[PDB]
Each structure stands twice: as structure tokens, then as C-alpha cells.
Motif scaffolding. Structure first.
Motif, PDB file in Angstrom:
ATOM      1  N   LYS A  97       0.858  -1.197   0.000  1.00 48.26           N
ATOM      2  CA  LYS A  97       0.000   0.000   0.000  1.00 48.26           C
ATOM      3  C   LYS A  97       0.882   1.232   0.000  1.00 48.26           C
ATOM      4  O   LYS A  97       1.803   1.337   0.815  1.00 48.26           O
ATOM      5  N   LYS A  98       0.607   2.166  -0.927  1.00 54.62           N
ATOM      6  CA  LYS A  98       1.351   3.425  -1.028  1.00 54.62           C
ATOM      7  C   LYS A  98       0.426   4.451  -1.647  1.00 54.62           C
ATOM      8  O   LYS A  98      -0.265   4.139  -2.623  1.00 54.62           O
ATOM      9  N   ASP A  99       0.362   5.656  -1.055  1.00 59.49           N
ATOM     10  CA  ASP A  99      -0.494   6.745  -1.540  1.00 59.49           C
ATOM     11  C   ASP A  99      -1.970   6.283  -1.679  1.00 59.49           C
ATOM     12  O   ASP A  99      -2.659   6.624  -2.645  1.00 59.49           O
ATOM     13  N   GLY A 100      -2.427   5.485  -0.724  1.00 64.98           N
ATOM     14  CA  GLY A 100      -3.785   4.961  -0.717  1.00 64.98           C
ATOM     15  C   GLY A 100      -4.076   3.899  -1.753  1.00 64.98           C
ATOM     16  O   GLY A 100      -5.190   3.386  -1.796  1.00 64.98           O
ATOM     17  N   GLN A 101      -3.081   3.533  -2.583  1.00 61.87           N
ATOM     18  CA  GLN A 101      -3.282   2.511  -3.617  1.00 61.87           C
ATOM     19  C   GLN A 101      -2.697   1.199  -3.157  1.00 61.87           C
ATOM     20  O   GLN A 101      -1.613   1.178  -2.566  1.00 61.87           O
TER      21      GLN A 101
END
Length: 111
Positions: A97-101
């Protein structure tokens, strides 16, 4: 070892979907595994099978579109999903998970 029949996810509101973890799959092994799911854990948090949407829950649902998982226990970076079943060794799915993705990394039955 790899479980390369599981290769992708779709991100939904407060949930993810694994379309290949299908209880109606043409792949007999995947179908049996999905029908026989006994436990789901995300980062060690036990998820409950829901009589329902999984948005923002520690819940899962297996239906016609696949395996739906709430993202309540997800954190930034690496996340580990462990799916146990009656007849098959545990499946470990890694997602990041990174930047809500949320990105699919791998599906394995680890030694």
C-alpha cells in the motif's frame, strides 16, 4: 512456492477484490480451495466471514466476483494476507500500500 493462478487484485472503496479466488472457478483446485476457506488473516488480524459489502471492515466475502476483503487492517508498505482452508496449505498473498493505492505483489503457498 508460487500460486500463479492468483495474479491480480482490484481496489474498491475500503476493500480489495481477488477475482481469481473464485468459488465457481473452472480450475477445480481453486474452486475447492475457495469453497473450503476456514480462516483469513491480514497482518495477523483475524477477519470474519460477513453475511453482507466489506467496506472498511476486518471482514471477507467469497461470491461470484471473487474474494472481497475489507482494508481495515491494511497499513502502508507490505501487507500479508493468509488464507487457510480445509484441504490446501495456507495461501500467503503479499500486497503493498502506497499513496492509498494497493498493489498486488505475489500469491504463494510458503514452506
Amino acid at each position: 512456492s508460487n500460486l500463479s493462478l492468483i495474479t491480480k487484485l482490484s481496489q474498491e472503496d475500503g476493500a480489495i477484490l481477488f477475482p481469481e479466488i473464485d468459488r465457481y472457478s473452472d480450475n477445480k483446485q481453486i474452486k475447492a480451495l475457495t469453497q473450503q476457506i476456514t480462516k483469513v488473516t491480514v497482518n495477523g488480524t483475524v477477519y470474519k466471514d460477513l453475511i453482507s459489502s466489506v467496506k472498511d471492515t476486518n471482514g471477507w466475502v467469497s461470491n461470484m466476483t471473487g474474494l472481497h476483503l475489507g482494508t481495515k487492517a491494511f497499513k502502508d508498505g507490505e501487507n500479508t494476507i493468509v488464507i487457510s482452508s480445509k484441504g490446501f496449505e495456507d495461501v500467503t498473498i503479499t500486497v503493498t500500500k502506497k499513496d492509498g493505492q494497493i498493489h498486488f505483489v505475489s500469491a504463494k503457498q510458503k514452506q
